[PDB]
Design a binder for this molecule. Structure first.
Ligand code: HEM
Ligand code: HEM
Lengths: 39, 47, 435, 55, 54, 418, 101, 51, 120
């Protein structure tokens, strides 16, 4: 395991949808999970 | 709040074939469009 | 190996039925991890106005506690195993699936059985989840896409259960009680209406025996599409969301494949797409060149006997009319003057989407459960490929004409939709005077 | 405020057409015949209106 | 300019009576008008394009 | 079959696994990214990520886009401060055409001035879309504060450079960072000889071991953004370890002990120590997770907290106190074992998908030049001892802290106060 | 070649774009392909073209020709727009071929 | 004509030929109807009563 | 802005012609007070006062006292303003310099036409 995807807390999974050119970027565990349950 | 809204009933204005909420409109679509377009075509013939 | 040989080599899905009627299906892919879940034929469409929000409420309280493992014991066990417990509720289906290592399949199946059958509903937990659900109903107004799609369902299926939203009205959420939630669970969480599906390292015999061990102790109207529009105009909202649809075939109808090919032909677009002007889809090319649309997508939502077929586009206040014109023009061109090459491109796109989605143990389990509920069978990829191959330009034109030409649309709007064409103009766009 | 020539509708049309119209600076005298044609049309209309009062 | 001269010739011929000298001139002039407009002018433009190396 | 790992003489790793699946995915992993950038050429990586569909010597932009759509395939560029990956996915039959397109994109880019000028606008749109989630801004500022150089560079073009990225800079980036020794070609669903043939046909020309950036230096600073959002997003991090070290595995085990991303939907994250520790003190809505980012030369570990503006300091201090608790030796063997189980399951689930397997194989090939089977990685994970986790917690507590917070900073603490 | 070159030079001098200081590509009809080619031109060349055209238009306004020393020579006339126009026409032809089938 | 010589355009012509023929018939009937073309109308049975 | 040059020129020349033809006492009073305050404020501090002394000696041959300035300003009336503005601003060929996106800037014939009013 030699990638920022190894840390799955959410590597900023900030990719944008596309077809024939979809650019994606990732950083590292980003939190933002399970706070969405409450406003 | 978007969930709260429910479309007001239009049964008073609805055509007889589509009055029921339990039947598909696909069966009656041709009949309804046929009535309206028959009105239109006869009007155009007179014109 | 050719693509057809790879399709033939795909492992088969094995379906078995317990005495209670629960259908156990599994696909063994020889992977360290597996996904197991229970897909239940329950949802909003089976709920009356009194109990519209019951299913979402039960899904909220599903993992909160169970009688056998009270409170967080279920969560603690699942987390200690390393598994992920997830659930989704839709108008027609509700699912609870656990992602876990293949070795942990027995405990995962036991937990799923506990959640489905022996789910305690403590009034305190019910009140807490009621607070949570009301706060989420407040939050969900932010998601313009969900709001517009709920509007589309409300207007398209007005007067029918399918119009009802999954979350349910706030009043029902406030007035729901433990008794009615338990009644909903009893009425709809029945063994004949549930499917146990697993994909990964599971062995069908092991899954079947575990289901016998745990799931054995269990019990042994077509909607009307109305051509109508809902317009909520809020100029403050930065962008306008519009969803337009016509009635589509249900799950069973074979026409779904050609319609999906046509929707692939129409395509999808977003401002961050990199193709831009050179994108194959004419509507996408026009949107990119003219900057008409921030995002645009075609959907083929299908229910048991009816479905919604159309597109959803996000536009600026001044671009709604042109985008509507171009989208309806694409539909009409498909109805009238579809061509072989674009049909081939759509068929390839549909094949790629079908194959890519099934990649993943969780998508495979989702497909197994939802197909068993919707079709009664798991359609092999080879059958999908054959049906896709049968589609041609004539078939696409015939299907689009059947479902698109001179058909009353269902339209929903949100935001600065002042330039959204009047329903008469939109309807007139659905037919061509030249044709 | 605004200039009436640029803001009044009829004056706006008239200004765009013949007052502030961006015209090439190298147009020759062969570009004067068309306006001569319009003048001829107006002259024909007036002279004919006066002739038709007696015809 | 050949076309302009041809149009002048056509006017002069149309004024003149139909007779031996004028009839042939009018026929050739009409042929030349259509030929200049349809055939000679475009081929000459192509030749000019080649000459300019365009 | 089994993965075939080969290092060509030029230095290009080609790895192929035949899963006999209907869809074939091929991805070229290049050791180029925000890290391999300097002040003058900041933002080049972003435009390179957005420039996949631009005209190349072999094919026009029209040809690339239209053909890839015609076969139904997809071309995507996934960027990481240290790596940039071009992945083409399509059906097994049409893989060769997309491979030709991909190699044309990577090895023969013609950054025509007009096309590059057109793409400049897309940088702002992409950054706006990415920053809609505040955690992206928080993480970019966190990396800026943590490191003086290299990894500090953002994954998104700086605003002052949005329209000033030049085609010459893109050519220089490609030439000096898109080199054979910095590339790995990983393909799922394709034969090894075909991949070798393609790699020889296109990638051979570029010489390996191109320009190498400076080693990252730890700034240990704080970047604070007051944007007025109701929720304060803050991250407190310290320099933990480089990827592939045993200390890195210990830090991952610590991340899972403190609590990684949630497991049960609408769950309370009961097993997570940080969530319970914060909940005991804060009864308003909150979110706390352990942040672990491992990079080739350095790594960052810390706590990421989303909280209401008034209670942000309480949440941050409580999570830090829980980490201190772990550092002082109050770590149970059962909790460590549960963290190990969660880590192993996470690795297996990550490699479950085709995209996950491709990314993992490429990352291993680039970082280490070899492929490690999942069993060995699990054995490494279980090799970690509880004392090592405690020592990693000690390293976090003692080490200099770099913090980035966004929102109504208000009562949010400063690094010195922490 | 010499005979063709001599006739081409005769045509070049017979046409007057040299007399006004214009180069051959300055005189091309601005169709959509030519418009895109101009849009793609480097800034220096675009500005030089703009000034040459403006000077020619001013000279024609006063019905004057540039001094004979300043006439553009046949040898030194540079076809700046031709490569960009060729690329544009190639792209259009590729798009049309894709449309055909 | 160079651009519109391809397999797709031949397919496009086939798709629209039925519509073009129908519109041509509409023009033919309208012309005969408007002009009361006795040559064509004599064949038609009921309209033949006019003459 | 590039698209506002013509309107600004129209309004500026209109103000010039309005002062030349139909100036009024109240605005004249406002202008006189503005000039008085500018003169008094500028001659504050050793640098401005010394600059005034030197430049006045070089140009006027004498430093005009503030009292003399005030007297001359008081003499000014709407009639005097109209006369002087007509002498210097009305039907007089202007000099125009433009820099930047000046395409909308009116041609010299139009600017010169703006220097006179057909009504007056
Ligand atoms: C009553 C008859 C006509 C009137 C009053 C008229 C008027 C005009 C005027 C005022 C202009 C603009 C001024 C100019 O360009 O010189 C113009 C331009 C033009 N007219 Fe006419 N015209 C007439 C007949 C015709 C005919 C018979 C033709 C061709 C057979 C024609 C073709 C043109 C063209 C091509 C232009 C554009 C010239 C350019 O852009 O330089 N017009 N017309
Ligand atoms: C471009 C516009 C027109 C042209 C080119 C035109 C041309 C002519 C010509 C060539 C004649 C024969 C003159 C003669 O044989 O002595 C004539 C006669 C006449 N036209 Fe027009 N005409 C135009 C417009 C009008 C209009 C607008 C009117 C009335 C409003 C009009 C009314 C007459 C009358 C009354 C005569 C009889 C004059 C006579 O018998 O000497 N014409 N026209």
């Amino acid at each position: 395991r030699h990638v920022v995807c190894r840390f799955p807390l959410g590597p900023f999974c900030a990719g944008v949808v596309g077809h024939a050119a979809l650019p994606a970027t990732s950083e590292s565990p980003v939190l933002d999970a399970k706070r969405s349950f409450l406003c | 709040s978007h969930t709260d809204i429910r479309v007001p009933d239009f049964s008073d204005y609805r055509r007889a074939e589509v009055l029921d909420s339990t039947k598909s409109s696909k069966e009656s679509s041709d009949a309804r469009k046929g009535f309206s377009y028959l009105i239109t075509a006869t009007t155009t013939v007179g014109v | 190996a050719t693509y057809a040989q790879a399709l033939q080599s795909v492992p088969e899905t094995q379906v078995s039925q317990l005495d209670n009627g629960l259908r156990v299906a599994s696909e063994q892919s020889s992977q360290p991890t597996c996904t197991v879940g229970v897909w239940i034929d329950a949802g909003s469409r089976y709920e009356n106005e009194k109990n519209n929000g019951a299913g979402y409420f039960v899904e909220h309280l599903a993992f909160k506690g169970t009688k056998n493992r009270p409170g967080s014991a279920l969560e603690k066990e699942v987390e200690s195993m390393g598994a992920h417990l997830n659930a989704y509720s839709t108008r027609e289906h509700t699912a609870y699936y656990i992602k876990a290592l293949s070795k942990d399949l027995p405990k995962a199946v036991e937990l799923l059985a506990d959640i489905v059958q022996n789910c305690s509903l403590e009034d305190s937990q019910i009140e807490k989840e009621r607070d949570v659900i009301l706060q989420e109903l407040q939050e969900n107004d932010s998601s313009m896409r969900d709001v517009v799609f709920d509007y589309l369902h409300a207007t398209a299926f007005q007067g029918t259960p399918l119009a009802q939203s999954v979350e349910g009205p706030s009043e029902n959420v406030r007035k729901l009680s433990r008794a009615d939630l338990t009644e909903y669970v009893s009425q709809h969480y029945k063994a004949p209406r549930m499917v146990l599906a697993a994909a990964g390292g599971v062995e069908h015999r092991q899954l079947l025996d575990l289901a016998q061990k745990h799931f054995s102790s269990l019990s042994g109207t077509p909607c009307r599409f109305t051509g109508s529009e809902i317009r909520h105009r809020d100029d403050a909202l930065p962008l306008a969301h519009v969803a337009i649809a016509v009635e589509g075939p249900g799950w069973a109808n074979p026409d779904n494949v050609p319609l999906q090919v046509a929707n692939a032909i129409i395509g999808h677009y977003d401002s961050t797409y990199g193709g831009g002007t050179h994108m194959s889809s004419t509507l996408a090319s026009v949107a990119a060149t003219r900057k008409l649309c921030q995002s645009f997508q075609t959907f083929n939502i299908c229910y048991a006997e009816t479905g919604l077929l159309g597109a959803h586009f996000v536009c600026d206040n001044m671009s709604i009319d042109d985008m509507m014109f171009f989208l309806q023009g694409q539909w009409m061109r498909l109805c009238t003057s579809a061509t072989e090459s674009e049909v081939v491109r759509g068929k390839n796109i549909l094949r790629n989407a079908l194959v890519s989605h099934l990649d993943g143990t969780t998508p495979v389990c989702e497909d197994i459960g939802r197909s068993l509920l919707t079709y009664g069978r798991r359609i092999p990829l080879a059958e999908w490929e054959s049906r896709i191959a049968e589609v041609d330009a004539s078939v696409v034109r015939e299907v689009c004409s059947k479902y698109f030409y001179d058909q009353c649309p269902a339209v929903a709007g949100l935001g600065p939709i002042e330039q959204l064409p009047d329903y008469n103009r939109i309807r007139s766009g659905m037919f061509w005077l030249r044709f | 405020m605004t200039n009436i020539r640029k803001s009044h509708p009829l004056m706006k049309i008239i200004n765009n057409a013949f007052i502030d119209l961006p015209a090439p600076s190298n147009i020759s005298s062969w570009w004067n015949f068309g306006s001569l044609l319009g003048i001829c049309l107006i002259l024909q209309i007036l002279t004919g209106l006066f002739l038709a009062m007696h015809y | 300019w050949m076309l302009v001269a041809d149009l002048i010739t056509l006017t002069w011929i149309g004024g003149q009576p139909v007779e031996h000298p004028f009839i042939i001139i009018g026929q050739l002039a009409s042929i030349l008008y259509f030929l200049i407009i349809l055939v000679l002018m475009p081929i000459t433009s192509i030749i000019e394009n080649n000459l300019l190396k365009w | 079959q089994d993965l075939e790992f080969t290092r060509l003489p030029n230095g290009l790793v080609i790895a192929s696994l035949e899963n006999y699946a209907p869809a074939s995915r091929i991805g070229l992993f290049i050791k180029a990214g925000s890290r391999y950038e300097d002040s003058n050429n900041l933002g080049t990586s972003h435009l390179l990520r957005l420039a996949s569909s631009l005209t190349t010597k072999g094919a026009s932009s029209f040809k690339i886009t239209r053909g890839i759509e015609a076969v139904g395939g997809k071309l995507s560029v996934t960027s990481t401060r240290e790596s940039m990956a071009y992945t083409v996915e399509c059906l097994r039959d049409d893989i060769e055409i997309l491979m030709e397109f991909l190699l044309n994109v990577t090895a023969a880019p013609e950054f025509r001035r007009w096309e590059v000028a057109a793409l400049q606008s897309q940088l702002r749109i992409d950054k706006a879309v990415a920053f809609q989630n505040p955690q992206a801004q928080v993480l970019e500022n966190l990396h800026a504060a943590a490191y003086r150089n290299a990894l500090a560079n953002s994954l998104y073009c700086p605003d002052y450079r949005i329209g000033k990225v030049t085609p010459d800079q893109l050519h220089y980036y490609v030439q000096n960072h898109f080199t054979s020794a910095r590339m790995a070609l990983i393909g799922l669903g394709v034969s090894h000889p075909v991949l070798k043939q393609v790699a020889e046909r296109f990638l051979n020309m570029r010489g390996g071991l191109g320009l190498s950036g400076a080693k990252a230096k730890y700034r240990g600073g704080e970047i604070r953004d007051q944007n007025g959002d109701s929720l304060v997003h803050a991250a407190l991090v310290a320099e933990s370890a480089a990827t592939g070290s045993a200390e890195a595995n210990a830090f991952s085990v610590l991340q899972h002990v403190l609590g990684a991303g949630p497991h049960v939907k609408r769950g309370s994250n009961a097993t997570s120590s940080l969530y319970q520790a914060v909940a005991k003190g804060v009864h308003q809505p909150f979110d706390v997770s352990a942040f672990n980012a491992s990079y080739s030369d350095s790594g960052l570990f810390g706590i990421y907290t989303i909280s209401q503006a008034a209670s942000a300091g309480d949440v941050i201090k409580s999570a830090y106190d829980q980490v201190k608790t772990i550092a002082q030796g109050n770590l149970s063997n059962t909790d460590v074992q549960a963290a190990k189980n969660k880590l192993k399951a996470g690795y297996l689930m990550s490699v479950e998908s085709s995209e996950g397997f491709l990314d993992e194989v490429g990352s291993q090939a680039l970082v280490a030049g070899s492929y490690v089977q999942p069993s060995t990685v699990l054995q490494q994970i279980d090799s970690v001892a509880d004392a090592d986790v405690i020592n990693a917690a000690k390293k976090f507590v003692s080490g200099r802290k770099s913090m980035a917070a966004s929102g109504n900073l208000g009562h949010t603490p400063f690094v010195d106060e922490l | 070649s010499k005979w063709l070159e001599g006739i081409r030079k005769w045509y070049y001098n017979a046409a007057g774009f040299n007399k006004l200081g214009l180069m051959r590509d300055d005189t091309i009809y601005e169709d959509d392909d030519v418009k895109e080619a101009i849009r793609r031109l480097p800034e220096n060349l675009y500005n030089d073209r703009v000034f040459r055209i403006k000077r020619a238009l001013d000279l024609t306004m006063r019905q004057q020709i540039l001094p004979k020393e300043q006439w553009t020579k046949y040898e030194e006339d540079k076809f700046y727009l031709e490569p960009y126009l060729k690329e544009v026409i190639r792209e259009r032809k590729e798009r049309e071929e894709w449309a055909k089938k | 004509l160079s651009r519109f010589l391809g397999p797709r355009y031949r397919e496009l012509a086939r798709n629209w030929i039925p519509t073009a023929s129908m519109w041509g018939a509409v023009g033919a009937v309208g012309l005969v109807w408007a002009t009361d073309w006795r040559l064509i109308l004599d064949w038609v049975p009921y309209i033949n009563g006019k003459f």
